[PDB]
Design a protein around this ligand. Sequence first.
Ligand SMILES: *Cc1c(COP(=O)(O)O)cnc(C)c1O
Ligand SMILES: *Cc1c(COP(=O)(O)O)cnc(C)c1O
Ligand SMILES: NCCCNCCCN
Lengths: 367, 371
Amino acid sequence: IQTPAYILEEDKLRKNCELLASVGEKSGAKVLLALKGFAFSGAMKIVGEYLKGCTCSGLWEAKFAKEYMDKEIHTYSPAFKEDEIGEIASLSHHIVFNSLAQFHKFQSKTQKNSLGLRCNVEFSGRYSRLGIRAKDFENVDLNAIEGLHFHALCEESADALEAVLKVFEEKFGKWIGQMKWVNFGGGHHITKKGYDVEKLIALCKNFSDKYGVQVYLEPGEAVGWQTGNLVASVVDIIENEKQIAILDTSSEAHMPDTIIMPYTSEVLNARILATRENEKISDLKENEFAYLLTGNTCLAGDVMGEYAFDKKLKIGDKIVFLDQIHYTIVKNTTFNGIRLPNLMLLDHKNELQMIREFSYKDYSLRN
Amino acid sequence: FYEKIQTPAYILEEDKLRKNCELLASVGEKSGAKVLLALKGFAFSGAMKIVGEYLKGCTCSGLWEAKFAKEYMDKEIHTYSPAFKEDEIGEIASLSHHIVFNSLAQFHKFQSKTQKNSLGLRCNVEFSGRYSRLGIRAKDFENVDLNAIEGLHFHALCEESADALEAVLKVFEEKFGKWIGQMKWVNFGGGHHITKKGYDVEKLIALCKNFSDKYGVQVYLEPGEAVGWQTGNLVASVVDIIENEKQIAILDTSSEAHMPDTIIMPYTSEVLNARILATRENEKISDLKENEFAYLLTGNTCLAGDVMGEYAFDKKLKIGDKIVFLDQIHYTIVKNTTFNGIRLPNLMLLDHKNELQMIREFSYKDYSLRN
Ligand SMILES: *Cc1c(COP(=O)(O)O)cnc(C)c1O
Ligand SMILES: *Cc1c(COP(=O)(O)O)cnc(C)c1O
Ligand SMILES: NCCCNCCCN
């Protein structure tokens, strides 16, 4: 590994997609990759051996689905524009509108697509712009709408989906039986250890039998969950009261959700002792060595955390940030002109494959 | 002016940029300090030649910024990194006039590959910070052979005043004083909000001039934000307007992808002809007046939290109206994203003749070739 690099493990992605395929086969639901979280171009054909297509937020994702996967394309945007709707309609099997005005504006340009409406389920979200509330369905012509859609969950359980479906059916139930399909969105933490997979299958099966509809699920995170790591090197080690490792990667540019959320990444063969925000998480044990892990941007707060290792770090050691393929790459930056981590794939034969190697132009042509 | 443009777009105004640069050139003129653009915050490719009319060069964090400085400006190049790497030091050395190291180890490791460059060390001034990895603390200078070192560097400020640089200089001279006289230059870093209304320019000039004279050193300043301050806006359109208790305008831009610092810091952008009533985080800022209309302005990503804030306007918004987010050229473009495949704002220049030029028009490949 020339560093930094995001490295997706084929074997792990395959195990995730096997489980998701199993959910679809046992429940009758169709499972789609939500590209927002996980769009790893080197793995799109692999994902497509298992899943039915992509869910896409607009033109660029729809184009990406077409090019990389070429399976079903489902497109939802809070904001379709006039200049893009034609190409989106040419590519998309399903198009979900966020408002009735959007539906009405674009219905005549989407006559070959199966149309849906996003439903605001209003379930603990106040003042959300996403979806249509139930009261606004009264009096509206739904003859041209074949699907209802919701997305209401983030890193959640089968029990949470049950709770959402209960409210979805109480508020929207009069309009469900007349649809061909319903899309339960994403946020289902299906490949996480301990998730109640049998419950999800039963919920999807039971709903489909109850209303005679095709169920769709559109996980993003669950596809990329624990499928790979960001690998960095120790470039320098300095002392300022604590021992501090400066790495060739950056929180802010390469793991931006660690700063936004905020959260602290786990590190292979290490334990988190304290967060960058100085929250104490654990105490150092015997025969452990504490380091601040820090990044290569010029920012004062480019700090991953304080971590306990069981050996001393040396310049040139590799640090492995765990579970860094979803909601990372898709949102990363070239801030401060920091060299981007290459995208790599560890294939089923344990051979490392370069998928994208970035260069100066990735930075210069974006400024 | 804005009506025929594809939105969204960041629009830099030449006249405003030139006013800032005139002022920074005035500081250099009067103090003898040499002023550099810190590319971290402002790297607008279409403006680099304009900035070079006024400033002496660029401060760069590494290889990619040094190459950009070389290509776009072709003036002095000053490189500092907390973490130089072996695979890049060669090319950084061929491009840079000054190289500033973050630690003695990094200096000792790369001294022999940097013989044609002027070498500096970054000083941790330790002032109001704890556990900072940036710079060397004064105690670690003691009894170190500094023969090969021609400059000292600090960067200790953010959006600050001439009085705050005065307080930092006092601490810097107190702690590192005994080694300043032997240097050829000192670099006072960035964070000087020189072009903000009210800044005490006169005092900055005196501080720089006195310091220069006292120690017999060439002083360097390396503002980023100051160069870009109030030079331009991000222009978006209202794509849809919906209601959920409040009126909500959904725009073709995203706080998360296009104004990331609004989410990270967090802070709320001002909007042309509007007043902030409340932040995305529900902080009350002001009350609606009698003849105004309140709207939540929100983005086009699929995230629930892609909300800019609640703002008061003098008239109702309509689909197709342009929303102008004020002061969006610095610490924006340089750190924006194609998250959710959102179409990037184009980069445009409103030039000195009031003509709008396209600098960069983005496309699908800017997204697909990054995933
Ligand atoms: C984000 C999103 C998804 C995927 O959510 P995950 O948490 O990654 O599973 C699915 N559908 C829509 C409409 C989304 O906005
Ligand atoms: C960020 C930075 C600057 C510029 O800072 P501004 O606040 O944009 O003026 C200059 N030098 C160094 C070393 C920096 O990290
Ligand atoms: N005035 C700039 C402060 C330094 N860094 C800011 C980085 C956040 N965009």
